[PDB]
Amino acid sequence: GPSDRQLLLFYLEQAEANLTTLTDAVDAFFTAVATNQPPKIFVAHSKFVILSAHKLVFIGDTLSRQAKAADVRSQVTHYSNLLSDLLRGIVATTKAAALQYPSPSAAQDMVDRVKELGHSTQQFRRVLGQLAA
């Protein structure tokens, strides 16, 4: 439908822009962990990842509320829920990596949630492009 297609193309463009900020924040986060930075540093970078990814959750929320097509609503609500779940996972594992610092396993858990977030957000964007086509 016309209104859905226009909505999707528009928010695909916004998603692509926000994905840039997220990639920079995730990269910076990985670099912090790879140079063995302490909690005052990697906890800050965690917050940057969360804030920038939350922009994509919000796009999903906005899109899902206004899309007419059942399959569009379904897919975008899935990714909004999935990304929201992963953000809580990042808050949880970051706190645990700080509380147990220095712990290589705690840090790898945190790193894994952030990696999964990176993958899932890229996948969200891919699906928007597919829906818009």
């Binding site: 917050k47 969360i50 939350h54 919000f58 999903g60 929320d61 809580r88 808050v91």
Partner: peptide, 12 residues
């Protein structure tokens, strides 16, 4: 979707 201010607050 959660409130962003609340997620950040829990790391602060």
């Amino acid at each position: 979707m959660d409130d962003l201010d609340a997620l950040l607050a829990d790391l602060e």
